Amino acid sequence: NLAPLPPHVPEHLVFDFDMYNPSNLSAGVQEAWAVLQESNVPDLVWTRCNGGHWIATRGQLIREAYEDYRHFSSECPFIPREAGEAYDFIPTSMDPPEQRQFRALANQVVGMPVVDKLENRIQELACSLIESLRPQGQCNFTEDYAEPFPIRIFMLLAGLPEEDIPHLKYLTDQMTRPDGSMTFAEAKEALYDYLIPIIEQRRQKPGTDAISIVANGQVNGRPITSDEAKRMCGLLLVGGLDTVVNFLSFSMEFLAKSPEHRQELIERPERIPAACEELLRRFSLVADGRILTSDYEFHGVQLKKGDQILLPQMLSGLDERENACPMHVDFSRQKVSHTTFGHGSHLCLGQHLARREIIVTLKEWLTRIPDFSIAPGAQIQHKSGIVSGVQALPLVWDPATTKAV
Ligand code: HEM
Ligand SMILES: CC1(C)[C@@H]2CC[C@@]1(C)C(=O)C2
C-alpha cells in the first residue's frame, strides 16, 4: 500500500521504506533501518508507505532538522498523519517558545534531582529481581526483567497501582508499535479516560507523586489546566512504559551473544558508563519526525508545507560519517556520537533516569549472572515502529556459575 507520488517529489528520491515493517527485520531492527544508509540511497528520500513522507537518512540532516523548529514543527510528530494529528502530548507537540514552560515543569518530575532521590529504590529493585531469577537458570528477559524493572519504578514515581500495568502497557504499545487493533486516537482516548479521574483527585488532594506535582504546577505564572496536565501525564506514561523496557532487551540480547564484552565490563567496571553510551548508540531505537510549516528547500530538495518528515534518532549514530564501523560494538571508541535521546529543544528529559536504570542493570546482572546465553533454538524477533522492541528474549544459564550477593 503505496500512496501515489505527490507532484513535487522527484522520482529519483523515492525509496519505499515502511518504518512499521522494514524489509530486513530478520537481521535485526537497527540493521533493517541501516539499509537507508547504503550508497544507493540519497540523503533525503520519499517513501510511499504509510501515506507518503520524507526520511532524512544522515546524522547531519537529522540534527539540522531538529534544530530548525521554525521549518520543522513538532505539531504533528508521528507518522502516519492521522497519528501525528491526534498527537497532543506536552511538551512534545509544541515548539519553542511555548514548549519551554511545559518542559521546565516536566523536568521537575523526571530530572536529575528525582533520579538522585530514587537511586536506592532503583538499586533495590534491580537486585531483588535479579536475585529472584538467578537460581532458575532461565527467564524470558523481556517479561521477567525488562518490563517490571523500569515499569515498577515509574509506577512508584507516579504513584499509580501496579495492577494497572497490563492495561497501560497495552495502550502505550498501540501508540508506538500499532497492531491494527486500535487507531492512535482510540489508544490516546483510552489512556486519557484513565488519567482524567486521577488528575482530578490529585488537584483536590495532592500527593508527592509525579502526577500530583504536574496537576498542581505553574506555567507562565498561572496554574496548569486539567487538559494540559492530562496531556503532560500522557507523555510521561509513554516515556515511562515504552522506552527503557525495549532498550534493555536489545542490550541484553547483545550481551548474551558476546562473552568478550561481558568480561570486559566485569574486569574493568570503570568502563560501564562508556559502555552504556556505546550501547545507546548501537541499539538506538526511536524514530519520530516533524511537519513542514512552509515551503522550504533543504539540502537542495523542495519540501512542501504540510509534508511530514521522519528524522530517525536511531540513524545518526549508525551513520558511518559519524562513527567508523557503526555496526561494531566498541566500548573504547574515542567518540560515541548519537542522538538517541533526541536533539534540539526536545532533548529527552528522562535521559538521566534511563542512564541510571541501564547502568544499574549492567552492574547488577553481571555481578550475579556473569555467564548466560540465548536459549538453544530461540529465534529473536525485533519489532519496528516509533519505538522499536524485541518480542521475547529467552535466556539460559547454569545456576552453578552464578554468584549470590
Ligand atoms: C532509552 C530510553 C529513552 C530514549 C531512547 C528516549 C528518547 C527520546 C527522544 C528521541 C525524545 C525526543 C522526541 C522528539 O524530539 O520528538 C524524547 C523526549 C522525551 N522523553 Fe525520552 N526517551 C527515553 C526514556 C525516557 C524516560 C524514562 C522518560 C520519563 C518518563 C522520557 C521522557 C521524555 C520527555 C518528557 C520527553 C520530551 C521533552 C520535550 O519535548 O521537551 N524519556 N525521548
Ligand atoms: C518519541 C518518544 C520516545 C518521546 C517520549 C515518548 C515518545 C514515544 C514520544 O511521544 C516523545
Swiss-Prot record:
Protein family according to the UniProt entry: Belongs to the cytochrome P450 family.
Annotated CDD domains: P450cam-like
Gene3D superfamilies, alphabetized: Cytochrome P450
Subcellular location(s) per record: Cytoplasm
Ranges that cross the membrane: none
Entry EC no(s): 1.14.15.1
Annotated Pfam families: p450 (PF00067)
Gene Ontology BP terms: (+)-camphor catabolic process
GO cellular component: cytoplasm
Residues that coordinate or bind heme: C348
Domain of life assignment: Bacteria
Reactions accelerated catalytically: 2 reduced [2Fe-2S]-[putidaredoxin] + (1R,4R)-camphor + O2 + 2 H(+) = (1R,4R,5R)-5-hydroxycamphor + 2 oxidized [2Fe-2S]-[putidaredoxin] + H2O
Entries under PANTHER family matching the protein: P450, PUTATIVE (EUROFUNG)-RELATED (PTHR46696:SF6)
Function: Involved in a camphor oxidation system.
Enzymatic class: oxidoreductase
Protein known as: Camphor 5-monooxygenase
Alphabetized UniProt keyword annotations: Cytoplasm, Heme, Iron, Metal-binding, Monooxygenase, Oxidoreductase
Record-linked PROSITE patterns: CYTOCHROME_P450
Cofactor: heme
Molecular function GO labels: camphor 5-monooxygenase activity; heme binding; iron ion binding
Pathway as given in its UniProt record: Terpene metabolism; (R)-camphor degradation
